[PDB]
């Protein structure tokens, strides 16, 4: 048998994954039959932390738990709703460890819209209705920090849609201080933004469709302003007025529209924000103190540290995490050195003249991220190994001495395992590896010391059974020189890949900014079905635009989102043309979202290379998406700054050019992300323009298009549509 | 066979009133519309209405309902529009053109009306010298623009920076004419200058100095 | 009353070349018109009904599109197609006009024939003098002149269209003043900073 | 050549018909190269009335001209913006024949939504934002007539969507008396009717999409009410505040939701009104007449004339239009026979004891429309010649002697010619015949006294010479025998049909209430394109619920919409297969609206006799589509009425039976009709259900699909579908 496309949808093969809390040094928290049970890395042992019939109090309700740092009480989730990518609402009820029993006084509300335990010692603090509530011990009654919330209007302590999408990744604007003394917040608010409005048709016994409306500011709108506020929560008392005392954002972001972008607490005392102007090529992480006779905050000038590009903007897609040391006296950032290249760098908390930063990394490859800081050592992961931009290792570098640099994942098993994801525990002295590919993803639990493997966490054993009779594709991760510079491409190839014969291929695309589509991880997902049982070698391709190479790559597409990442996909199609094993009348492409412009772009673009693809939920043209992200890239859509370039680099204006190809348009009408206006209007001037192509939506579906069933049509529609134009079927 | 000919440029004070022509000839008169148009200098232009000549029929642009009034003799195959009680906003290029059941496919030579209350003033025409050839001939001191220069009566090469400037309400046009080392210096060149206005028609030719 | 919006102001495209053109409404249109004016004269019918051609109209022309964006495609271009096209629309009372498509023309550069000349015998007369500096022949339409009087930096300039038959632009600045400080000077300066040399260009006089 | 898609999409072949304008009883209007002519039909001469030249004078933005009834005013229309089906606003100006100017004073205002002359006479009534005004004379002020006007929510002498679309099929709810005395107009309060919303997305420049919104009773939901008012327009003056007189509703018409569905002015003194209750089968017309000395209209209950139906609803769509003779005293309106047949029943101003009237016509026949009532004559057109429910014919009969029942139209051209409509002069004297088809259209002139054909109109002869490279179609109208009942057909068969092949079978279908699919009428359209060059028979058959013959048929799909008309589609396929000449391996269906309903229905059946189909713009469940026309058929959706059979009748319901067949499913975005909620609910239960299935939405189109490039994309779309199922 083949991996079928029925495999695929029912989850017939489920790559399995391991998952703990690390809930102390040496102890971690793992599921085991829906019982939570606790580990000691110290031993061997376990103990049940916390059993299943307690989940069940709640029936099959229970959607997540939490644990209060002191391991004191649960917080156990309950009738989650979800909203957008991140944010949703539930219910919450808090467990007591010791009493065994439910805390039934002063109950968390209905609807929660979000919640967390401080850092330490079991306080709470959460949002309901756009208001912050504190609540000192589960027992107690909230205290109101916030009396200005407003559904789409006034948020305190989450983000609006926008910065929930494009600025922090998550629903959560509140930072507990370390101690617990400080509650932090951000404050937002909507009141100029404009509405999207879309039709949600619901179960069809509403008789009438429902409107729903976001305020979502698209490119050069009126955007979300910002405030900041610390409260103290030692001094909360239904006696006395609950005051927060406010941060103002630098001058130098200040003198026009500008955005908070991240926020860390460095001690019980100090704080780093860091803030970025709507042109985002300029950005300012403010050390703050506090000031405990006036009851302020202060951010002098001097614990200014700014960051900008000549070349594009800052950050990957924002300005990277600080890392302080415990004192709070210097911390590691990754930023571009000189060469473009992203490295980890230290700084003070004072600024110096030309603020110079000490670089602990140089080399022609990047840091993906800092994993752990302790006193002496520095985890982190990057692609230098192998210089496989699409590799991912685990690395350890001393602090006093920079040549100290041991590969922690490199030889574990190289055939095997290349793409590295790590957890370390709160004084990193042991450490989970998640291996994800090539082979069978492996996840095993290790001593920091020695690097000694203490146990097999997840080998997938069961998975490498079962796929025993299945024909496997392979996969090739490999590059080609264009211009004296290496790009990297994967392939999916069908099972025992011939040279000598040629197949039909399919462009698998996403290309967007800082994106990367070619890399050394394991899936089995569509692509495997294709390759596997309809014999279609599935291939992607990292060109200018792409992210992990440096900033002469990254950014090479600035002001230009339509341009090069196009031409560059054309022709590595051109150059898997010249391998000589791809049947060149049977050249396919297909994406999401920033994918599916890049397809419908590719497909516009008149080059003869590609005979049909499939466009999902694509930008049409960036006036329609959100500005946070579009503005980033491109300029403000203003004959002042790039609104010729808005105008040229539409989906729409290419229209003409789809008569030489079979285009397939599919997009869902929930879609609060990408809105379905964009391939509304791609529709529409292909109508305009006389040309035939074949269009699907899918009624209530949102930029996931995840509902089970929605799910399953999408992939077999799209999966017939290559049948037709490779003629298989 | 289809030829629109307006009457000459206009000078005229603010208040005053003032009706230009738009002679028609080689077709059947009776049979189509004539419809005015505005040009102010650089802007777009703006329709200002139509007539009908066989009935007398008018139309008009809402903003020049009281400005414009259109009338028609069939006699003199001759279209006419009053524009009544001008001021500043009203000097502008002026056309009438026909239509033909779709659009305006004829266009007259336009009128050049210019309202201020300034006196009209004579232009003072200097020949100018040198010391390939390249001479001169400034005009200086005049109100109307329509100035029209001309070199030896006829004979068109070389004429250029012959658009002028409005300086303190006298107009400082210029131009000039390029030839061989051996055309002129030893032979005769006239700057032939016209201005209906103050009926002037001036002669300067350029001498050696 | 629908506006029309001009797409661009000026395209300056080289002959031979394509050359599309296109008038944008803020509501839907049925029928498209266009006109060619060149400065001077009146303006000229070129392509009626979106795209039908005039009685006389040449043959490289073509037009086209529907609802609130149609369009006109001049082919191969020659010098005389350098003029100012204007869109026309009527399927809605009162006609009115898209501002302007100026068609300009790409060609060869080039630099100026840099002349001078001092005041005439009859303009000092006039108790006043006027210098007059010439600059007859060139594409590059940009410029930056300066006027010194023995060595220290009422001036003006003028300009001309793009000619039908050669495609070239020029310039004269003009600088008047009395004639008893015009007799308290000796030397007089006209230079230029024109697409040929970063260092300015040398032409004056001397009484 | 065949008759290709490329020919019905840029509309190569021209049916031309002609429309005249009758003015007076011998003298008609006609346009000529944009010039409107007068012709006088005692003579044979004609006469310029408006030279292009004056349309020219606002360029191509005119769209109508309404010339006066005293002919010295010609109302010019231009600015035309599209609203609903029938609905729009424009702008007037006013043109003076007599002295050939427009009047520049006291000017219509912009954005009017509805405008008319009087009767006799040159007076004016408009509405504009909601509110009615009127002029007695061009160059006179307007009198406003009502100050409660309001964007969706009061309307003044217009309807709103539902009264638009399903009741009147006007924009106009204003009518001017016999000499203008009088000016009646209906008010309608959309307050609390809930309102449909759905996204427009515009030009490609605007970035935020805007909401529409409309109120729009769906099934069971709160309907607009209405009031009725009459106001005196002689004497409107700025000085007197003026006062409309209203009219109150038959009481046992007011003792629950209802409609107001006819207005007829019998004199200067009199008026019907044609009421209408929710549930649709009892309607009261009320003759009601003015008193001169205390200012109010009297309804008596002796001049109220009851109809009723036990079986279904009363009229075809509506209670037909009353036809009154000149004294006012009788009126003629169509009316079920004791058998189910539609015949001119003859009435007095006074209602007889248990509501009876007399019938001047009879038999298993039914009059289609009443034309003209004359002091001596009534004509009207009926399907009677040939017993062929889809013809056509104009009749001529007399009041004193019901036998004297002339046919003015059978002989005149009986291949050519059997389906007719007619346009007479002011009193009967002459009458313009329109010959539909089955031939090439064919208009003509004709004096009533004898039928002497005047002249030829228009032949369609520069059509014939055009057509006669194409290789042409044919169309086949019989009918089929079911449970002793015939049932009527039509087959667009492809060039010279071998009935000894087989073909491929498109069955086209509508099939709603009252409809008519199979008739004599002549169509150049999609069908003979897949006839002409796809060799495809393309099929519609007029099952139980269609109408023109007898209740029996047309009452019964009562309460039971999506049951026997689906049931009887299915089978008249049997039919066409049982005929031999059926492959029976490439049979379709499609339809549009009620056709997309039927379509998706006959599809989600499971009775294997169709490969594929296309349903455009289909209702999906009926508590979707509005009230007025759902409840006529299905009542109200309660347990205490027919919610069962509404739940039961949905397409969604039928969502696994389709994974057996092809389905294309279509439908416009801006769809104010049947609203695209009603496919996006379809998908949605077909996605639920793991079928496959195509789509194709149309950005910002509406029910019509209209728009050029739409129009062509979405039959070259459902070509391609039917090329795949079928080749």
Redesign the interface.
């Given at each position: 048998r083949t991996y079928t496309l029925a495999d695929y949808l029912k989850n017939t093969f489920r790559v399995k994954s391991y998952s703990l809390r690390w809930v102390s040094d040496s102890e971690y928290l793992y599921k085991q039959e829906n019982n939570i049970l606790l580990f000691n890395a110290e031993h061997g042992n376990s103990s049940i932390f916390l059993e299943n019939s307690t989940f069940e109090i709640f029936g099959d309700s229970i959607s997540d738990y939490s644990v209060s740092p002191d391991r004191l009480f649960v917080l156990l989730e309950y009738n989650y709703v979800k909203q957008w990518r991140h944010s949703y609402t539930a219910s919450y009820s808090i467990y007591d460890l010791n009493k065994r029993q439910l805390i039934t006084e002063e109950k968390i509300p209905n609807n929660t819209q979000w919640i967390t335990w401080s850092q330490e010692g079991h306080k709470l603090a959460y949002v309901w209705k756009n208001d912050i509530y504190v609540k000192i011990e589960p027992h107690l009654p909230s205290h109101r920090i916030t009396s200005t919330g407003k559904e789409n209007v006034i948020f305190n302590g989450i983000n609006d849609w926008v910065y929930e999408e494009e600025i922090f990744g998550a629903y959560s604007a509140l930072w507990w201080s370390p101690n617990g003394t400080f509650l932090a917040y951000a404050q937002f608010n909507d009141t100029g933004v404009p509405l999207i409005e879309y039709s949600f048709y619901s179960d069809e016994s509403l008789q009438y469709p429902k409107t729903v409306w976001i305020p979502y500011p698209k490119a050069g709108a009126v955007n979300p302003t910002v405030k900041f506020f610390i409260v103290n929560t030692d001094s909360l008392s239904s006696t006395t007025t609950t005051i927060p005392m406010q941060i103002t954002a630098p001058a130098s972001v200040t003198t026009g529209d500008h955005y908070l972008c991240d926020v860390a607490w460095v001690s019980e005392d100090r704080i780093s924000l860091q803030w970025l102007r709507r042109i985002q090529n300029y950005s300012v992480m403010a050390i703050c103190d506090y000031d405990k006779t006036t009851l302020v905050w202060n951010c002098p000038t001097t614990q200014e540290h700014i960051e900008t590009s000549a070349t594009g903007w800052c950050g990957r897609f924002r300005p990277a995490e600080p890392h302080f040391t415990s004192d709070g006296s210097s911390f590691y950032k990754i930023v571009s050195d000189k060469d473009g290249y992203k490295h980890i760098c230290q700084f003070q908390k004072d600024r110096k003249p030309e603020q110079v930063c000490t670089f602990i990394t140089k080399g022609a490859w990047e840091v993906i991220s800092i994993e752990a800081l302790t006193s002496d050592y520095l985890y982190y992961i990057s692609n230098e190994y192998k210089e496989m931009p699409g590799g991912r290792n685990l690395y350890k570098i001393q602090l006093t001495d920079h040549t100290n640099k041991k590969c922690l994942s490199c030889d574990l098993n190289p055939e095997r395992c290349q793409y590295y994801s790590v957890s370390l525990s709160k004084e990193a002295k042991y450490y989970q590896l998640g291996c994800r590919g090539p082979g069978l993803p492996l996840y095993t639990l290790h001593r920091s010391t020695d690097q000694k493997e203490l146990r097999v966490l997840e080998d997938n054993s069961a998975l490498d059974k079962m796929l025993q009779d299945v024909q496997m594709p392979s996969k090739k991760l490999d590059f080609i020189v264009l211009n004296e510079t290496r790009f990297w491409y994967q392939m999916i190839l069908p099972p025992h890949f011939d040279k000598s014969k040629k197949y039909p291929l399919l462009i698998d695309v996403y290309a967007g900014p800082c994106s990367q589509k070619a890399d050394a991880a394991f899936r089995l997902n569509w692509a495997t079905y294709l390759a596997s049982t309809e014999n279609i070698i599935v291939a992607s391709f990292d060109g200018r635009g792409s992210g992990y190479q440096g900033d002469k790559i990254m950014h090479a597409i600035n002001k230009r989102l339509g341009t090069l990442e196009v031409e560059d996909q054309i022709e590595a199609a051109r150059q898997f043309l010249k391998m000589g094993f791809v049947d060149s009348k049977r050249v396919a492409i297909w994406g999401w979202s920033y994918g599916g412009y890049v397809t419908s772009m590719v497909l516009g673009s008149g080059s003869g290379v590609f005979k049909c693809g499939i466009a999902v939920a694509p930008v049409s043209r960036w006036e329609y998406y959100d500005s946070v992200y579009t503005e980033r890239y491109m300029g403000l859509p203003t004959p002042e700054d790039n609104l010729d370039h808005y105008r040229n680099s539409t989906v729409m204006s290419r229209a003409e050019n789809f008569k030489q190809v079979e285009y397939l348009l599919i997009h869902g009408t929930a879609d609060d992300n990408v809105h379905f206006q964009q391939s509304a209007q791609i529709s529409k001037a292909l109508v305009d323009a006389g040309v035939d192509f074949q269009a699907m939506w899918y009624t209530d579906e949102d930029h996931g298009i995840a509902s089970s069933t929605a799910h399953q049509h999408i992939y077999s529609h799209m999966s017939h549509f290559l049948q037709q134009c490779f003629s298989l079927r | 066979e289809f030829q629109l000919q307006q009457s000459g440029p206009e000078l005229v004070k603010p208040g005053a009133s003032v009706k230009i022509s738009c002679k028609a000839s080689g077709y059947s008169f009776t049979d189509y519309n004539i419809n005015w148009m505005k040009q102010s200098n650089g802007k777009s232009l703006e329709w200002i209405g139509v007539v009908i000549p066989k009935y007398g029929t008018t139309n008009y642009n809402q903003k020049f309902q009281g400005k414009a009034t259109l009338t028609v003799d069939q006699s003199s195959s001759t279209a006419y529009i009053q524009l009544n009680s001008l001021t500043s906003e009203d000097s502008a290029v002026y056309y009438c053109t026909r239509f033909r059941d779709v659009f305006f496919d004829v266009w007259g030579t336009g009128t050049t009306v210019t309202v201020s209350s300034a006196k009209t003033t004579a232009p003072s025409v200097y020949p100018l010298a040198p010391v390939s050839v390249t001479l001169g001939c400034l005009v200086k001191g005049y109100f109307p623009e329509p100035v029209t220069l001309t070199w030896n009566s006829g004979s068109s090469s070389g004429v250029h920076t012959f658009p002028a400037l409005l300086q303190s309400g006298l107009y400082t046009l210029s131009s000039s004419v390029t030839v061989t080392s051996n055309t002129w210096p030893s032979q005769t060149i006239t700057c032939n200058v016209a201005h209906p206005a103050s009926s002037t028609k001036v002669d300067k030719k350029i001498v050696p100095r | 009353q629908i506006v029309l919006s001009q797409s661009p102001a000026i395209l300056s495209a080289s002959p031979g070349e394509k050359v599309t053109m296109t008038c944008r409404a803020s509501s839907s249109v049925?029928?498209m018109?266009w006109?060619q004016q060149k400065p001077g004269?009146?303006?000229?019918?070129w392509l009626?009904?979106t795209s039908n051609l005039?009685?006389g109209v040449p043959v490289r022309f073509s037009g086209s599109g529907?609802?609130?964006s149609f369009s006109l495609t001049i082919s191969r271009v020659e010098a005389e197609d350098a003029a100012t096209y204007?869109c026309?629309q009527?399927?809605?009372?009162?006609?009115?006009?898209?501002?302007?498509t100026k068609l300009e023309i790409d060609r060869a550069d080039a630099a100026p024939?840099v002349?001078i000349?001092?005041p005439?015998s009859?303009?000092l007369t006039?108790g006043g003098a006027?210098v007059?500096c010439?600059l007859?022949?060139f594409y590059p339409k940009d410029i930056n002149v300066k006027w010194k009087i023995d060595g220290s930096e009422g001036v003006?300039?003028?300009?001309?269209?793009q000619d039908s038959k050669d495609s070239t632009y020029?310039?004269?600045s003009?600088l008047?003043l009395t004639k008893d400080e015009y007799e308290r000077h000796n030397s007089y300066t006209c230079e230029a900073t024109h697409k040929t040399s970063t260092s300015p260009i040398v032409k004056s006089?001397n009484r």
């Open positions: - | - | 049925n029928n018109h006109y004269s009146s303006p000229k019918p009626h009904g005039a009685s529907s609802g609130t204007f026309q009527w399927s809605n009372h009162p006609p009115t006009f898209g501002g302007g024939t002349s000349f001092p005439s009859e303009q006039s006027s007059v010439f007859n022949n003006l300039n003028s300009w001309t269209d020029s310039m004269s003009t008047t006089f």
